[PDB]
């Protein structure tokens, strides 16, 4: 199928409380596989999935050094941004970076990414062409001019098209048991009386992977989007996700209502009813 690799980085300054907190995590699709945290006692990048543990001490050495370098780069970058935005040295500020690549079924690059944010807003992004920049403001435009002179887009392109894709392919293979397995939702409908006149029908989807799913309620076939309470897809803590959709139904009219589940791990799309 189609897959993705991402590295997320967050630096948070803390004036008067030492150097900024740096936390980076790596993902393949919806699976966390590496992490580094600067406030751990002797920080190293650590595995978080079984298929990455097989990498040699030299992988972990290099990964760790890259993480330390990025933390340090971020510390300086955070000082720089106080200048660009004419800010006081008093407050806490946040620098975020994401980069990675998407591959298709064949394992060819579909799209590469590299983007930064300052204080939770867009700062600068590498465009889909992997050759030009979108700067969100005049401060980011100063970064753009420096990165244009230093030919940074060309360096990111070389990586996003080469190593990112090659190592993602490698991880998909080594992690083929899990990364290439979709777990279908386990589904049921529950009935929650509100009064003698109404009850809540709640349609559960549990234990699914990857996170992407569609839950909708129908009444007689028509769509109840306007009346459906749909909670955010949430992690179960074991690699799988949960979600539910709920409608308030007139007591006795429960069998007019059908819940519909689509998810890639299902042999066929599901249709469910409250089963008293």
């Amino acid at each position: 199928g189609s897959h993705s690799m991402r590295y997320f980085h967050t630096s948070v300054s803390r004036p008067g409380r030492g150097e900024p907190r740096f936390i980076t995590v790596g993902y393949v699709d919806d699976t966390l596989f590496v992490r580094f945290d600067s406030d751990a006692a002797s920080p190293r990048e650590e595995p978080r999935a079984p298929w990455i543990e097989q990498e040699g001490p030299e992988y972990w050495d290099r990964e760790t050094q890259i993480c330390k370098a990025k933390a340090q780069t971020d510390r300086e970058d955070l000082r720089t941004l106080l200048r660009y935005y004419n800010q006081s040295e008093a407050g806490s500020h946040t620098l975020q970076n994401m980069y990675g690549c998407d591959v298709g079924p064949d394992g060819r690059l579909l799209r590469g990414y590299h983007q930064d944010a300052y204080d939770g807003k867009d700062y600068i992004a590498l465009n889909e062409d992997l050759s030009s920049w979108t700067a969100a403001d005049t401060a980011a435009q100063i970064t753009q001019r420096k990165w244009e002179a230093a030919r940074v887009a060309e360096q990111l392109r070389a990586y996003l098209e080469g190593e990112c894709v090659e190592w993602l392919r490698r991880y998909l293979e080594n992690g083929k048991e899990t990364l290439q397995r979709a777990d279908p939702p386990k589904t049921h409908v529950t009935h929650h009386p509100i009064s003698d006149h109404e009850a809540t029908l709640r349609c559960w989807a549990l234990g699914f992977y990857p996170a992407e799913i569609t839950l909708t309620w129908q009444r007689d076939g028509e769509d109840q989007t306007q009346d459906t309470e749909l909670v955010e897809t949430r992690p179960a803590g074991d690699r799988t996700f949960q979600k539910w959709a709920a409608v308030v139904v007139p007591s006795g009219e429960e069998q007019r209502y059908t819940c519909h589940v689509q998810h890639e791990g299902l042999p066929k799309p599901l249709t469910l009813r409250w089963e008293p």
């Binding site: 790596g26 990964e63 990025k70 780069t73 720089t80 660009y84 700062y123 970064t143 940074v152 990112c164």
Partner: peptide, 9 residues
């Protein structure tokens, strides 16, 4: 694996 990052804002 990661990309080394060799530029500043």
């Amino acid at each position: 694996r990661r990309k080394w990052r060799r530029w500043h804002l």
